[PDB]
Design a protein around this ligand. Sequence first.
Ligand code: HEC
Ligand code: HEC
Ligand code: SF4
Ligand code: SF4
Ligand code: F3S
Lengths: 456, 170, 174, 395, 56, 49
Amino acid sequence: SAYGKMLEELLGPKQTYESVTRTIGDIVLTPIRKTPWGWPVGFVIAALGLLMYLFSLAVLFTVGVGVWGINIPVAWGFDIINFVWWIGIGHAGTLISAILLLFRQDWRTSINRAAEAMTIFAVACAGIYPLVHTGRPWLDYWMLPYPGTLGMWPQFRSALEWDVFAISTYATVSILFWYLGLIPDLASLRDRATNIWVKRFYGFLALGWRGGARDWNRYEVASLILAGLSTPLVLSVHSIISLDFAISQLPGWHVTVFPPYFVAGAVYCGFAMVILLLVPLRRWYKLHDLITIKHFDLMGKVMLASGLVVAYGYFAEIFYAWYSANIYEYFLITNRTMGPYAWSYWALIVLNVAIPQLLWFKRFRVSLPWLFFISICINIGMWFERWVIIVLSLHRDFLPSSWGYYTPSVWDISLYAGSFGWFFFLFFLFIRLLPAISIFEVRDLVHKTETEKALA
Amino acid sequence: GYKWGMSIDLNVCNSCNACVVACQSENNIPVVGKDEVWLGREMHWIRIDQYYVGDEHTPNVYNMVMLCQQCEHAPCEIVCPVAATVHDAEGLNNMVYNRCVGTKYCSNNCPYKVRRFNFLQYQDVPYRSPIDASTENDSIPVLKMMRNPDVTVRARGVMEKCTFCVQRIN
Amino acid sequence: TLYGLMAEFDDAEALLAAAEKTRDAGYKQFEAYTPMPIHGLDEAVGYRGTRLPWVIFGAGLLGASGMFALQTWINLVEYPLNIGGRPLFSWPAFIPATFEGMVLLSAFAAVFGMIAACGLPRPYHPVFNAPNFERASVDRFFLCIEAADPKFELKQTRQFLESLGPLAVSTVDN
Amino acid sequence: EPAALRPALGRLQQVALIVGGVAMLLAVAGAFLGAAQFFHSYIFAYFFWMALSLGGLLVLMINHLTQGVWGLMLRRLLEAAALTLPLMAILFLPIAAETLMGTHYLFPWTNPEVVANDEVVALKTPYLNVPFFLARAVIYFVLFIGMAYLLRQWSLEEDAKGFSDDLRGRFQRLSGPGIVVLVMAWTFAATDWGMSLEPEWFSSMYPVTYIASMLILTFGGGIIALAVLKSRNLLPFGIPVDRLHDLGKFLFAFVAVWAYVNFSEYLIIWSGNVPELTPWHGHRSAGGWEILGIVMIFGHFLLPFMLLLSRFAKRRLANLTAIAIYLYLIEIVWYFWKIMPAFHPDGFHIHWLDLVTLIAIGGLWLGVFAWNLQRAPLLAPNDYRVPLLRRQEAS
Amino acid sequence: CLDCHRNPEKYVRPREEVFNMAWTPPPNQLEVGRRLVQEYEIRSSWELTNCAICHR
Amino acid sequence: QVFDRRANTLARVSIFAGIPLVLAILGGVWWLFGWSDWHRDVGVEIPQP
Ligand code: HEC
Ligand code: HEC
Ligand code: SF4
Ligand code: SF4
Ligand code: F3S
């Protein structure tokens, strides 16, 4: 049937419930020192990247926030370009896990946890920059509302006060919706462990899951509503992060279309990171029977449906800069196209509007070497968008006597390139400790493929 | 109450830079090293701006001495998350150096970029390079006397701006 | 002590048709433990909807009217500030922080309101000590009948559980 | 194949065309009393039906792009709503007839006094002038009509010839790049017709807050038209109560997106109140327009967000259409609060033309939409999702 | 400090009995301290709690 | 079977008598170090020369 021809393109040749469990119950529950190579010599490169993270933080806390090369015109440099970037990555991990659950689509089941757990670790590296770019990080509890023996409360008019309410909600909701999606799987890992103190570990995480006829109905409504709550959440988290630029009167920042273009940029850069992390998980970890090439064909289309709202945002920011008869937004066009950071706006149009237009053609989407090259070109390209928006619009603004440059210091590089350590330290821990791909959601779409094969 | 306002006459601002030091002698503004001024981190609440209009061989030169305009609709206030920089009932933007967690967003919303940020421990900087931290809590005892006893000596991670000399208004 | 008997099923469609029975047979204290959510098991076991969306919304309206009423109280009653010339009751700029107070308080009542809805945060259910239940979360489908309902006899309902199509009807001790 | 469907849309076609002919006869007759109030009211009534004519085209490209049983139910309610763009191009001529004539009723960038007194408007004259504003208008009604006519001839080809995988590929080969053309040719149509009514005011996401409201009209209208067809028993398929819940979930998710784009457009302009972006929300928050502003916050978002939140009022047709009927009666208020205060900004001014010329363009719209329904079997019998709709209907 | 700046009438006493440490506030401290606020022209809770009174 | 029956109460009192206990610790250290008249030397006779 026409419905079976799209289900059979997401799974391998033949799969049963104990086969989809064994395929994921062998990437986990394999013994330590039987764990595959490339993980420990990938977890060490990730741990050495974490020692660069905790040392670029210990140098930042001790010496100051001014080891970053941030000037006074451009006080927001890599610390916020990488905050909006890292949180932008995490938004298309929930568009897979939560927004696609609204559309009841099934190409999300295999890429569910490898993107939902990708969100959290892209928030654990994005939730640190608003806690560390402050000059006095120890007083970051002042951005929280609490009766604190001095009548001051946070402002609730600035988007850095909505950030600590978006990032903290995005954290403790994409964690709970991720931990919700694990209690059935951690019950599969517990029942299949055959190792005391390993069965107890997953038996403690999967609280009492039990399966259950009614426990599954309460799950299907808790997972649907959480998916229906993480759809306006991530539509607002990178819209609130969008508003720490759009509530400022700066020329390149007060662009009103930032909310539906930062969200479109977060889904754009996020699917690039999902593809960058699944082509290795599909190749190295033998998950060819679960993460089929139709998942990348569709991720390349959703990464295209978002990349055209970004490539539209580059025009709704150029046109309405010109359409605004301001001297200061006319200059915005003649400061990005020309100017000292002209190459930033041209290593951006090339990397978001020229190179990733190949996602239109199935020749450049099914072919994973191109989808992996376009995803590299988007993650770098969507970093330059966050550099064009922040630094290229700050360093040349009103009052020409306040024009800086922001050459980033070594402690911006040794913190951003070390942030990938804290991302892969957790992402390699998640692969080894937890199922790197949903089990019951892949038990379904196997029960759904046999249910459709039953009629035909 | 008192509507504290200022009226600068740029016709007679000959860039003597005496107002730049007068704000330093009065407001305990810290010196910054040359290595950190080239990074655009000079602490100067008041600055004079040459502008060189036309004919780069023989240009007329004009000064707009730029300080914190104490905006009534201050855009640098709606953007402080912990609500450090607020306005006054007298009518001047109050920078509160102690409630400032160093978010440093306020400068990005400031249209004039007057707000200067204590990025490192800017204090006794020509006598102790600010890129260290072994002595950033140790103060030169001879320098502690030139400081104004009614202006906060800012720590690191605290933005500042021309406060209309509240130490003289209060 | 006796908890009940359960029947192991090798496929999913034979359990749903069996969970369709035991409800038109007159039983009420029973469940069907599956590895995946079988569409149709609920409303066939007789659950007839969960009351969880109403406590999510009740706690989500409390996190929205409890966060908008916090920022308004912070900016009107308790220490109103002239921060930026903006009005005290700024009706915008309160909404992006009462929205994430609605999303946060709901998702706190969506997980912990589900985990509390089930008897979830307790291991050792009296059903795990079944001879093959450790396959319920992998491959096999089960249907346990508790020993609480009056229409239950260890010799009688065992014959009824074998009148269905089981793989092995087993006495699940407790 | 209901036999009482061709004479049912045939009655609605001829009745709406009389309503759209007599009310248009009164709009022109009312124009002879005040020549300015007609065009002030004609542009308001033009958007609400253009953003519904084009709203059906955006979802038709979404429906052709994604395999859903929703939209198959609308594949002719969208191909007919999109095929009234050959009419909105014709009904645009009275808007072009004002730009050509020297009256400056609609657009003040045509006033040679405004483009000589003001400087903000005189720098947009490269984009705001008569020979280019009309060349752009023809360009939209070549893309909008073209993408609505290509997606129809292939749909009539799908029924006549048969569903081939190449024809399904031709839909997604144009529904993909079509939306890109559809959005971009709209963000030059909402600045031409909607934003340049206040030419001293610019804001991106002004053409985006229509797009999020184009999807409420074509989904609210999708549930409305599917109810009038099911209440009279004219549908060729019983509406599955779970896929009516899909149209209700789309309608509910797009009241949330509409409130996400209208509020963020305000939260941005309100926070940093640059006096160039402010005059739009400034004139629409004082003088009585705030009454239509607080309706957008409560009667447009907060009332149909609490109502559309439950499975009830999304699963029942009588409770979901009563919200779709109500969302139309608020979007009409919204396209009035958004377009009209460009004229008489210093006060709430409503005229009897705002109701007469709205049922004039609408009567012509519902007349062409009804005529563009009778030329299709309302189901597209050779579809790949109608074997998926024949079940979930017969259960 | 803000508790008396936001509401001085609860603690403001006569000017003459400032250095009288045996001063217990009357049972009607309000409507007597309220009366001393206008007598002293003590500024409002809006002018007295605005980041520049203290923290100069 | 894993997780013997004692894990019922040991996981039932760790949410009902262990969460309100840690919450009463995080408040008893909040008041003690952020609200009390103790960390501020109220009533503490400071020794002079
Ligand atoms: C009630 C007993 C008070 C307490 C506790 C504090 N203050 Fe006060 N203060 C009080 C009054 C009635 C006034 C008069 C205000 C006026 O305008 O006449 C003040 C004033 C001040 C001022 C100066 C006011 C100005 O115009 O600048 C300052 C700087 C001040 N108070 C500081 C201050 C501090 C730091 C306090 C906590 C330790 C404090 N006051 C407490 C009444 C009361
Ligand atoms: C006089 C009534 C004051 C007014 C007006 C403001 N503040 Fe205050 N502040 C005052 C005192 C006596 C103290 C000391 C409190 C203590 O713990 O000893 C403070 C302290 C603060 C702090 C704490 C700073 C720290 O380093 O811990 C902050 C952050 C602070 N004050 C902020 C603040 C702001 C933002 C104000 C205007 C809106 C403000 N204060 C006014 C006295 C008074
Ligand atoms: S304003 Fe400044 S630069 Fe001008 S004369 Fe006075 S001190 Fe000198
Ligand atoms: S520092 Fe700048 S933004 Fe802040 S009040 Fe002064 S002029 Fe305005
Ligand atoms: S925005 Fe906020 S906390 Fe400090 S430096 Fe800037 S003030």
